[PDB]
Amino acid sequence: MEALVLVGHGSRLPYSKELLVKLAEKVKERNLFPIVEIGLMEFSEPTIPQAVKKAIEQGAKRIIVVPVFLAHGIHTTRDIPRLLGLIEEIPEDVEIIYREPIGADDRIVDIIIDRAFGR
Amino acid sequence: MEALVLVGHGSRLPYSKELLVKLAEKVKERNLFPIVEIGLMEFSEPTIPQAVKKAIEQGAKRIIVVPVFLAHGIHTTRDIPRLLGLIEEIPEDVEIIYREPIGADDRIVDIIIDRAFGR
């Protein structure tokens, strides 16, 4: 009924996609969502429209799109809401729910501190 | 003796810089590092060389640079190691320690899950 679509930037290097794939596996391992797909904005497959359609084709009416980006910017406020046709292929009786990016979350400061000490 | 320099992407929008500023305040509030500075790779001040120099000028011999980026890519493997002159400046007796990005950390999946439910 509900699907989780994780959306990342994409790069010409492979690390960005690898990251999204790992993240999606980890959310799969938590068994919270019936359906979990990934999409990359640029340079990589699957693309955002691809991931969105793949979620509909598995029988999702409500698509939760989380932008796995640190902050808001051009990507999260123009490009992505575009590719989701939220500002200008979605069946009329399906809603895209566009969520918020990671932000300055306390857990991010925990991670930064670990990273500072090579952990 | 040691300084923490947090480095982010930077944006034509202000949100990226706001994020780094908030993150740096939160690490300041944990009282772990004598010195804590921020730098943006593009279109914002302070820049990476700026932040690095500001840390030396406050008496740091060892500069911990943490790239606040989700994954490796062009930015973390070319641009930043360049701007830090690690590939192609800095006092002989000062070491830059270039740390690892955020990666597919379990806490990132926690954050994604919260973000999926609007929390």
Ligand SMILES: C[C@@]1(CC(=O)O)c2cc3[nH]c(cc4nc(cc5[nH]c(cc(n2)[C@H]1CCC(=O)O)[C@@](C)(CC(=O)O)[C@@H]5CCC(=O)O)C(CC(=O)O)=C4CCC(=O)O)c(CCC(=O)O)c3CC(=O)O
């Ligand atoms: C659009 C632009 C500026 C603009 O329009 O403001 C901008 C903006 C941002 N990029 C951000 C993230 C990443 N960008 C990349 C990669 C590229 N980004 C590129 C360009 C630009 N990036 C400026 C276009 C200038 C122009 O073309 O006029 C490319 C296409 C360069 C090109 O092709 O010119 C190059 C790939 C090709 C290459 O260079 O080889 C990667 C992957 C990687 O680094 O490999 C990450 C993930 C990093 C991570 O993993 O976290 C964030 C913060 C996102 C966040 O908050 O997480 C912002 C801020 C925002 O979105 O506002």
